[PDB]
Each structure stands twice: as C-alpha cells, then as structure tokens.
Amino acid sequence: NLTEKFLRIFARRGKSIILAYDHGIEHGPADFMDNPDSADPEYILRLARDAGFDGVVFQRGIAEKYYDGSVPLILKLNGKTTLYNGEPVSVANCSVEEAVSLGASAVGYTIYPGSGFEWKMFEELARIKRDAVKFDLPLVVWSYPRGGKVVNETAPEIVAYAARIALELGADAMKIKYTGDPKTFSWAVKVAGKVPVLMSGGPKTKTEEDFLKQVEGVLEAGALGIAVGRNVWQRRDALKFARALAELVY
Amino acid sequence: NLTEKFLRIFARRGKSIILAYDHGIEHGPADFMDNPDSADPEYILRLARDAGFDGVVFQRGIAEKYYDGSVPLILKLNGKTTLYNGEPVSVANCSVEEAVSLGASAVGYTIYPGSGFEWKMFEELARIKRDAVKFDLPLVVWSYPRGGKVVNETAPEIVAYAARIALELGADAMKIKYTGDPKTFSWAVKVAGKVPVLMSGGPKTKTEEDFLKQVEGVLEAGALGIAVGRNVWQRRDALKFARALAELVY
Amino acid sequence: NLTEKFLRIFARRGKSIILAYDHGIEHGPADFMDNPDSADPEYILRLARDAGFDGVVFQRGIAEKYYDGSVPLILKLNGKTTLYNGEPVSVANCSVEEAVSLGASAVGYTIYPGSGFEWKMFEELARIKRDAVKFDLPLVVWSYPRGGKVVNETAPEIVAYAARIALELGADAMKIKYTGDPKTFSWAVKVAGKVPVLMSGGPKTKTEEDFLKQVEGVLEAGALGIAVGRNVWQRRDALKFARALAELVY
Amino acid sequence: NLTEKFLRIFARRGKSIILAYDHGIEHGPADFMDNPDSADPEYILRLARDAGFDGVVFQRGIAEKYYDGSVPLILKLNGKTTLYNGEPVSVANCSVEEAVSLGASAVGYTIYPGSGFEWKMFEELARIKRDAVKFDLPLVVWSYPRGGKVVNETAPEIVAYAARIALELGADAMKIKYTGDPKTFSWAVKVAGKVPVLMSGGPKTKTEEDFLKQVEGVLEAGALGIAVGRNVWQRRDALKFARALAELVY
Amino acid sequence: NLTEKFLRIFARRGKSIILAYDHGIEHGPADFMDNPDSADPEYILRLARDAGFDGVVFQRGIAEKYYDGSVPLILKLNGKTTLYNGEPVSVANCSVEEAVSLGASAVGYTIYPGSGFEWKMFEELARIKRDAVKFDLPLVVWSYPRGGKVVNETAPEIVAYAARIALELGADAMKIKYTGDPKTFSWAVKVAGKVPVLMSGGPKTKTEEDFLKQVEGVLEAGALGIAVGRNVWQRRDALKFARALAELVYGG
C-alpha cells in the first residue's frame, strides 16, 4: 500500500506541507527575483527543515547537485517550460530507478487532461506507475486539466475531474488546484476517495492572510494539506510565514 | 479458448450483466451527481454483489485501491477524457501483467475505428492481445467507431462494422452500442460470429421501462447481455432496478 | 528460398487461386449482404475446400476462432477500415510469430506507396520481412499505391510501380490490381521478375463472363493466378462460379 | 578504418565506378522503358562485370533474389517513392545485419538535410552507423539536401553542405550531386576531407559526350569516381558506353 | 561528481576555453570561407593545442576520422542544419557509449526550450544523462531557447531561463548565449548555481576588441569561460588572437 507509505513519510502528524521547488524549469528564474535567496536550493532545504515541513519537490538536476537527505524528497520526473506554446505536454527527464538512486521517497508526475497530447502523458504515466510499484515509491500526480475544452482551470467541475482522473490512473497521492471555496473543493476531495489530496499553493497572494484563509478552507474540505512554493519562498519573510503555515496545518 | 473462459466466468447462467464503472476518467464525476453514492467504488461492488451481476469494469487505480475479489473483474486498460478535443484516441495506462496482479479475470480495451488515430489503437491492441493470450485473460473490446467518416454512431451499418472489427482483431468478447431495434442489432450479432456481444447501456433513459425494452430487444437479437453503468448507478433506486434487470436477463 | 516454398504450398498445380477474406475489417460487413452466408468464416473454408482452391486469407481473429487446417492459410497481418479518412495507413495487429502459432503457411501485408505514411508501413514491413525469414514463412505483399500523387490505381504505370516496389522490398509473392488488359499487365509481371504476381479480384463484376475474361487476361500476361474475394463469395452461385474459376486457372 | 576497407574493395585501381540500381523503388519502372533489359537485375550484374566496374547498389529484395557474389555489393538500406508528396523522408527497409547475410560489402543510406523530417533520418542513421561499425561494413551516405530552405540542389553551397554533413555524421564514403563544374565541386571534395566522394550520375544526358564531360570535371575536382545508373543502363549501347567510362575513370 | 571531473579536465587553471567546431553540420562550410584552413579539422586541433586551450567540440564523424587524443574532447551528440525550417529540433546521431570509444572526456547536447519539439529533446536528454552517469562522462548542455514564445535569444530573462533549465535537467556544465552585459549575465550565472557556465562565442565580431570586451564581461559575471568557434577560427590571425584570449581568460 503506497498511499500508506506516503502518509507515513510525508504526513506523520496527520496533515502535510510539501515545499515545491520545480519552478526553475516550469516558470524559470523570474519567480526568484522577489526573494533572490530562493534561487539557491540550499536556502530552500534550510527553509523546509527550519519550518518543520514534511518534504521538498525537486527536479533531477537539483536533487543530484543539492539534495542532502535532510528532508524527504519527491522527485518530480517531468517538466516543461512556459516558453513552450503547443498543446500542453510534459515528458519525463528522469526514471523512477534514477529517482531512487538520488534519494527520493516518492516520485511526481504532471498530467494535463484535455490536452491534445493527453495520451502521451497517460502512456508515459503507465510506465512510471509500473516502476513506482516495482521500486516501492509512492506516485504523486499533479493533475492539471489544460488544453482541449478546459477554459477555467479552477472551476469546481474541472478540479473534481482532475482529482478523479488521478485516482483512476493509480496516483497514491495527488496535487490539484483550489476551487476558491471549501464546499466545491470537498467534492473534489470526496471523488478522490482513499487517495489524499494536496492543494497547489498557486501565485503569491496579495496578503498573507488571503493564503492562510485558502489553506483553512482546504483543510475544512478534508484535504491532506498543501504543496506550496511561491507563497512561501517568494516572500522576504519566508521562514516566519512558513512557521505560521506549520502552526495552522499541524 | 478464451471466449469459453470468458463465458464460464462472466456468463455462468448463459447470459451476462457487467456493471461498468470506468466513467470516472471517461466522463468525470458529473456522472455521479444524480446518485452521489455512485462516486464510491465500495458502493459499486456492494451493488454488483447484491444484484447478482457477473462482473465489474474498473480502471487500474480503482482496482488497486478498492477491488476485493468479491465480483469478477474486467480491468479496462485504456482511458481518455471528454475534455480532450483531438481525433479520438485512448491509450493503455496499464499492462495485462499488472491487471493479472490486481485480480482481473479479463481485460478491456477501447478502439475507435475511423479515427485519425485508429492505427495507434490497433498497434497497441496487437500487444495487449498477445499478452492476453500469454496470461490467459480474455480480451473484451469496446468497439466504438468515432471520427473519420463516422457521422452516426448507432446507425445499423456502423454498429455491424464495429462488431466485425472486434472479431477480426481478436476480441474474445465485445461491447458495442445498440442500434435501437432488435432486427438491425441482430445483424451486428451475426457478423460477430462466435464472439459474444454485450450491449453498451448508454445514457440514462427517461424511464426505467424504456431501458427494459431495449434490453428485451438486445436479448431477442441474440446478444449475450449488457454492460451497463449509468442506467443502474445513476438511479437512486439503483439496487431495485438492478434486480429487475437481473430478473429479465437471467 | 521462400518464393519456392510459397509456390509448393499455394501453387502446386503451377497456378494459384487464393480466396481472400480480410474484407470484414477492410470494408465491413456491407460486403456480406448480397450473399449472407459469406459472413460466416466456416462457409468460406468449405467453399475454398469444395472448389479445390489453394489458400485462404484471414485476419488473426478469424484465424484464431475458425481456422481448422483444412486449406493453407495466409495470415493478413495488417488492416485498416474504410471509415478512416487520413493518408492511407495500415498497421500490423498481429506478429509473424503469432501467425505461425495460428497455423499460417504465409503472412500478408499491405503497403500504400505514395501515402503520406508510406514510411510507417515500409518501417514495419522491414520488421515483418525479417521475422518472415526467421520463421521461414513466405511474405505476400499487397502492393496498393494510394495517396500522394496516385489518382487511378489501375493505370499501367502505377500497377507496374506497385509490382516493382514489392520485389524491391523483399516480397516472396505479391497481390496487385489488374490494369484491365493483358499487354499492360504483362509489363507489371515482367518488372516483378522472379516474384510471382496474383491479381486482386476487385469489385463484383456486372457479369460472371466479365470476371472470367479478366482472369484469362491475367493468365495470358504470365501471372501466377488470382487472389479473389467478392467475385466468388458475393455471388449466390458462389460454389458453381468458383469451380468454373478453378477449371479456367488450373 | 572503414574508409580504407571501402577503398580496398570498391577502388582497387585508385578510382571507382559503382553501378547504381535502386531506381526500381526510387523512380519506378518508367526508368526502364528506354532500354527494357534494364528491368532485369541479372542484366545489370552482367553489365557491371563485363565493363569491369567496382560494385552495384541494390535494395534488399533485389539482392535477396538476384545477387550472386560476382561484383561487390552496396546494400541500399532505405528507400522512398516519387509517388510520395510529403517532406522528404526515406526509412530503412533492411538492417545492417541482414545486409551482411545477403553478401553486402557495404551499406548505403540516404539523408535529406533540410527536410522537415531530417531528424528522423539522422536518428536512424545513428543506429545504422553503430551497426556498420559493429559488422565492419563501410557506410556510404547519399547526401541529398531537399525540402526546407533548399531550392537549388546542385548549387555550389548546397553540394558542399551535403558533403560536409556526410563527413560529420560518420560516412565512410559519400555520394552527392555534381555542381556542373570542377572548381565548385572541388570545394565539396575538400570539405569532405578524408571521406571519398562519388558523383551521382543524374538524369540521362542529351549526348554521351555531355556525361563524359561531367565525369572529367568530377575527376579533375579530386573525387574518387562515380555512382552511375541511368547514364549507363538507360542507353541501348549500355555496355559500349560503360567500357568508355571505365577507360576514362581507371 | 561529474561537474568536478569536468572542471579537472577542462578547467585545470580555474577558467576554461573550449574550441567549438560542430559548425560543419550546424551552419555548413560557408563558415569556413573567411579562413579556408578552418575546414580542416587537423588545423583546428593544432590551433587548440598551440593556443593552450582546454578542449575541442566535434561531432562523431570528425572525432572518428581526425581526433588524435592531443586535446580533451567534448563529443557533441546531436546536430541539425540551418537548411531545416520546422520547429527547432536536434536529435542524437551518436550514443554516449560510442563517444567513450572515440576518446571523449565529455558529451554535449543541445536543447531548444520553447520549441514545439522541446519534449523530444528533453526525452532524449533523459537517456543521454542516464548514460553519461553510467559511463562517468560529464554532460555539457547547450541551452538555447528557440521557437514558441522566444523572440529575443539574448534577452536577460531568456538567457537566465536557459541556464536554470540546464541545471534542472542535470547538466554538469552548460553553454549559453551572452546577454551583452555583465550585470544581466551574472543573474544567469547565479541561477545556474553549482553548474559552471560557458559563454557561446557567437558570430564573428566587427573587431577583435569587441569580442574581448564581451569575454571580459562574461568573466566579471562569474562564468567559467567561453566555448568559442567563429571568433577564433574565422580569423586569418586565428592563432595570434587565440593566444590573446588565453592571456585574458587564464590570466586577466
């Protein structure tokens, strides 16, 4: 049971905070200008350790050059850039076997349901899922419907669809976008069934209070917790705010 | 002879009712709003068992997290979403070998004859068929002509073509759409030859009677039975109606 | 020498008649309405036997469910539908190794020279040819230029091109379209060199005498014989006409 | 050193004449109407032997059915037709290992630099090159820029680019188009470095003297020799003209 | 640690000059007309050696026919032409295992982030990276955003993105385009973290002084050095200018 392994490692207190840091490929270093220390992966690991968070998410290159075993690692296997303009697609730049050798306790993979290339990711996810079982590493699916008929990505029915697809394809945990309110988000949590749901943190909010409120409703909806990047490390008071998030979530 | 194994497991009474539940990925959870318990796979298994049905159809993730051995399982290997807009294509997210380990007694695969991508599914079906023989698991093909010159999916000649394609490609059993009357549907059944035909239930009918009459025409046409989803679990009297279906079919 | 093996099995009398029956996938069951027994593969095998023909052509599913060893089998490895609208392509749904296990004495494969996807079929034919040598099964190529600059598939220069391409790619025997007269067809036969040529029967002719004249022309051009489907089994006097064909060819 | 092996087998006199005969697939049998014996590969082989040429180029099907060991063989691994309309692409229909078993002393492969599919042929050439080294067979690259920005295939800069690409990708010898004069062609020869250059013969010239003047210029430019097809076997005085070519080149 | 192996071989003096010569496939021989000896890979090897440069970059065919062990080799595994017109893509024509047998001390691979085919190169890079680790050969990534939304390849934000992508995908060293000034380029160097950055030399500058100034700024920005092709071997005084570059990079 890989969900149970995931919960044991990443949610020992019953809830989870994962510090996400795949943004260097997905968005590029413009994300790091607000708080320049955020460009240094060593600063990120220190933030995770000092705030008492459960994990970090790195791409293979960051894991290879910087990962030191100090916080449980989810190795994000695929990645794309915002420079890309086609139908959404993100392919693996790392195998599960290599993730294991880099010290990962879980692997991550993004799918874009609805994309003209949805099939390419489902096909590749099949191989990754099989390897995840073989190496006994939980699979965490970033389920982000995009392209095709998707217009609003945070619409209640799209997020619920995202959650269900991750369950159906074999996710042991999932990361999905927040709908903006606990009632509609709890439907997504419900259709995910036994698979725990992490809220994606999203763009830095106008105030810290706005994000604490989002996180409050995420927990009320029954989610396991949050996978947060920008709303922590884009802030110059990153550590202070991270510890307030820890207080709220645990 | 894998047709005979299929009949022994899924049609021990001489006719078959399979409760289909791949809808989480195919349509998403909007299908589950009419009868919210339908979002829970545990509820689906209870329902199948209590109505005395012959099997359930799950995607790999639902099988892994929920399947308990209580009703014979057809593991549906491929899936796509309705969010997708390209030429119809659905790729495997699971192998036959993995289906075996999840407790499947048969595997399912959808083809869309006529699609700009028909070749991609025929290519993949070739590998799945070979594996099905190797692992001695019957292959059930969902034969759904779509894309290309397909303008009307329930037209007599399209359904008959669907049925014949499934036979020609190596299906041990098949699932196809109803034409709306027993005379035309019996042509589809005839061209399928030794391979048994299950009617796809389709959208929830206006009345329960309408669906019973379809079912009385399907059986008259010489089909093995039905693979039904929505017309059972979308109804709040799901168990009562399921038992009426069992009475009629068995 | 696989051509010699082909001739020994399928042309023991010096000429050949092969009863083709891959139409169920290629054209669908509308082909079977004229003579409804033609939908039954058992009837096809009895017809081939009773007329004293040399072989039958089945797709894998028909071979698996119906082939009984009573007439030598050519297993047609690839297939496409008429529902398909793209640039012509037909991919393998079966391997040579599986054809061997189903009792085939030869394998068949269609190429569409000129298609936007000509390369996909040449690539796959390379693998099939290599396996045909390895399993010592003659490879029979259906050479049907289509797409690209091809307009009339029966023009003398197109049929001769078809024949030459089959020879160059390694066919041990080939099936090509008739040009409509023995002089032009004999050029196609000549450029095929040591590889024997079977005439594709084509659509059911207006009279029996018309088809018989085509066959005579084919034999005068130096072809090995005919691979005929519709002009035999679409007729309600199928067996009687088949025996007249046998009289003419042998 | 596979270039040295190439020169030992195909250029024992210090210069080389190769009789090319892949035209059956590339152009089809219309090429053979001028001199109908040219359609017979046995005639081609006799012509090569009687004129004292160094080798022949055959596709796999011709080699398998006709090659008798009498003249060194270059097995042309890839081929396309003129019926094809897409961006130029030619895929392998044969492996190096099979070429070895057919009696080849070298393998040939066409690339079309500039094509929208240039990548598909570079990817495949990588595998063929690796195999050629493993089986110790020289790789002869037909370097024919086509598609993309290429509009004048015989332009000095295009032919020089063709030559250099073949060197960079690992060719042990190469075949390229003539620029029409020795000065510009000698630049292509120079950028090819240690890799010997064979001139592609091209369409049959108006006079035998026109062709001899191009051959003179190719020799003046420092090329190894010619790979000639049509300008020999499309002529009814093929043998006589072939012996005049031998006189000039050797 | 393959970055450390790269630095030991290609940067023993603390900075690096690599003489790049994959241009025969990428641009074709028009690049060689200015200084015709440049078409001869032997002249190139003599040039790197006589100027005391750290390495050369060759495609497989040049390495097989000409490489003589005299200067460390980076085997550039993929290549495309300028004749090509589609969305930018460059596929491997050589494996890491073959590079090892040809005498390479490192392997090079170009990615074009933003291309409609970016996924094809990331997919292939994954296999090459896995083989580089297996054969213990440093992977040098040419990170050149092109296609998609990219309209200015030397814009500060594009170059910084290029640098970060190379780090994220597993590069042990990288080659990226210069932004034209040391302040913006130093942001690219910073986001590259522990992975060293080599400046791509670019088109031959109008004066030798212009190129030196670009190199000065690259060094000031904290880069490891330069991978230069045209700005050396396209010049008739190639050796003299190469030695001035050596003075500036290893010395200045």
Domain layout of chain B by residue ranges: 1-250
The rounded Cα B150 to chain-centroid distance in angstroms is 20
Among A29, A86, A120, select the one facing E191 at the smallest CB separation: A29
The answer to whether E70 and E61 have CB atoms below 8 angstroms apart is: no
Interface check for C170 against chain D (CB to CB < 8 A): the answer is yes
Strand pairing category for B78-79 and B91-92: antiparallel
By C-alpha distance, which of A204, A226, A161, A176 is closest to A16? A226
The answer to whether E115 and E121 have CB atoms below 8 angstroms apart is: yes
Q: Is D21 a residue of the active site? A: no
Widest CA span in chain B? 44
- Helices (H) and strands (E) in chain D — how many of each? 11, 10
In the three-class reduction of DSSP (H, G, I as helix; E, B as strand; rest coil), residue B20 is classed as strand
Residue type, E222: G
Residue type, B216: E
| Burial (CB count <10 Å: 0-12, 13-18, 19+), residue B212 | middle
Token pair of E197, please?
Answer: 């950055």
User: D79 and C157: CB-CB below 8 Å?
Assistant: no
Taking the alpha carbons at both ends of chain B, their separation in whole angstroms is 24
User: A93 and E167: CB-CB below 8 Å?
Assistant: no
For residues B159 and B177, give the distance between their C-alpha atoms in angstroms, rounded to a whole number. 7
Among D40, D61, D82, select the one facing C168 at the smallest CB separation: D61
Rounded (to 5) percent helix, strand, coil in chain A: 45, 15, 40
For residues C238 and C230, give the distance between their C-alpha atoms in angstroms, rounded to a whole number. 10
Interface check for C210 against chain D (CB to CB < 8 A): the answer is no
Active-site annotation holder among D144, D161, D178, D204: D144
CB atoms within 10 A of CB E14: 10
DSSP state of A110: E
Contact list in B for residue C28 (CB cut-off 8 A) is 157, 160-161, 164-165
Token pair of E123, please?
Answer: 């997919």
Taking the alpha carbons at both ends of chain E, their separation in whole angstroms is 29
Q: Where are the alpha helices (DSSP H) in chain A?
A: 2-10, 23-26, 41-51, 60-66, 96-101, 118-135, 156-169, 182-191, 208-220, 230-233, 238-249
Active-site annotation holder among C144, C161, C178, C204: C144
For residues C223 and B242, give the distance between their C-alpha atoms in angstroms, rounded to a whole number. 62
For residues B162 and B145, give the distance between their C-alpha atoms in angstroms, rounded to a whole number. 6
Among D115, D158, D170, select the one facing E60 at the smallest CB separation: D170
By C-alpha distance, which of C145, C144, C143, C133 is closest to C106? C133
Task: Tell me, letter by letter, the H, E, C secondary structure of A124-141.
Answer: HHHHHHHHHHHHCCCEEE
The rounded Cα B62 to chain-centroid distance in angstroms is 16
- The CB-side HSE value for A73 (13 A sphere, CA atoms) comes to 25
- Taking the CA of residue B32 and the nearest CA in chain C, the distance in Å comes to 33
Interface check for D140 against chain E (CB to CB < 8 A): the answer is no
For residues E65 and E47, give the distance between their C-alpha atoms in angstroms, rounded to a whole number. 18
Neighbours of A, requiring at least 3 CB pairs below 8 Å, are B, E
User: What is the H or E stretch that residue A200 is in?
Assistant: strand A197-200
User: A161 and B81: CB-CB below 8 Å?
Assistant: yes
Active-site annotation holder among C15, C129, C175, C204: C175
Neighbours of C, requiring at least 3 CB pairs below 8 Å, are B, D
Token pair of E32, please?
Answer: 């060689």
Interface check for C70 against chain B (CB to CB < 8 A): the answer is no
Among B130, B165, B187, select the one facing C25 at the smallest CB separation: B165
Contact B/A (≥3 CB pairs under 8 Å): yes
- The CB-side HSE value for E135 (13 A sphere, CA atoms) comes to 21
By C-alpha distance, which of D99, D117, D116 is closest to D108? D99
User: B161 and C81: CB-CB below 8 Å?
Assistant: yes
By C-alpha distance, which of C72, C80, C77 is closest to C97? C77
| Burial (CB count <10 Å: 0-12, 13-18, 19+), residue D128 | buried
For residues E252 and E250, give the distance between their C-alpha atoms in angstroms, rounded to a whole number. 6
By C-alpha distance, which of E227, E212, E138, E224 is closest to E188? E224
- Closest alpha carbon within chain A to B84: A114
A vs B: CB pairs below 8 A:
114
Q: Can you say whether the dihedral through the CA atoms of D59, D63, D66, D70 is positive or negative?
A: positive
User: D130 and E81: CB-CB below 8 Å?
Assistant: no
User: D61 and C187: CB-CB below 8 Å?
Assistant: no
The answer to whether A232 and A242 have CB atoms below 8 angstroms apart is: yes
Active-site annotation holder among E175, E178, E204, E250: E175
Among E125, E157, E190, select the one facing A30 at the smallest CB separation: E157
Q: What is the resolution of this structure in A?
A: 2.1
- Closest alpha carbon within chain E to D167: E61
The answer to whether B113 and B90 have CB atoms below 8 angstroms apart is: no
Among B118, B158, B170, select the one facing C61 at the smallest CB separation: B170
The answer to whether C110 and B119 have CB atoms below 8 angstroms apart is: no
Interface check for B94 against chain C (CB to CB < 8 A): the answer is no
By C-alpha distance, which of B40, B39, B61, B93 is closest to A173? B61
Token pair of A92, please?
Answer: 């693996």
CATH number assigned to the domain covering E1-252: 3.20.20.70
Interface check for B164 against chain C (CB to CB < 8 A): the answer is yes
Contact B/E (≥3 CB pairs under 8 Å): no
Task: State the DSSP string of C143-174.
Answer: E---STT---TTSHHHHHHHHHHHHHHT-SEE
Q: Is D112 a residue of the active site? A: no
The answer to whether D23 and D216 have CB atoms below 8 angstroms apart is: no
- Residue bearing tokens 């910073």: E190
Contact list in D for residue C165 (CB cut-off 8 A) is 24-25, 28, 81
Strand pairing category for D78-79 and D91-92: antiparallel
- Output b/e per residue, D54-92; b: 16+ Cβ within 10 A: bbbbbbbbbbbbbbeeebbbbbbbbbbbebbebbbbbbb
| Burial (CB count <10 Å: 0-12, 13-18, 19+), residue A205 | middle
Interface check for E196 against chain A (CB to CB < 8 A): the answer is no
Token pair of B42, please?
Answer: 């545990």
Query: What CATH class has A1-250?
Result: alpha beta
| Burial (CB count <10 Å: 0-12, 13-18, 19+), residue E194 | middle
Contact list in B for residue C120 (CB cut-off 8 A) is 119
CA distances from A35 to A238, B163, E161, E188 (A): 9, 62, 17, 16
User: B25 and A193: CB-CB below 8 Å?
Assistant: no
Contact list in C for residue D90 (CB cut-off 8 A) is 119
Token pair of E219, please?
Answer: 């060094």
By C-alpha distance, which of E171, E126, E183 is closest to E144? E171
By C-alpha distance, which of A182, A163, A165, A2 is closest to A96? A2
Widest CA span in chain A? 44
Task: State the DSSP string of E63-132.
Answer: HHHH--SSS-EEEE-EE--SS--SS---EESS-HHHHHHTT-SEEEEEE-TTSTTHHHHHHHHHHHHHHH
User: B157 and C28: CB-CB below 8 Å?
Assistant: yes
By C-alpha distance, which of E243, E239, E237, E245 is closest to E219? E245
For residues D99 and D91, give the distance between their C-alpha atoms in angstroms, rounded to a whole number. 15
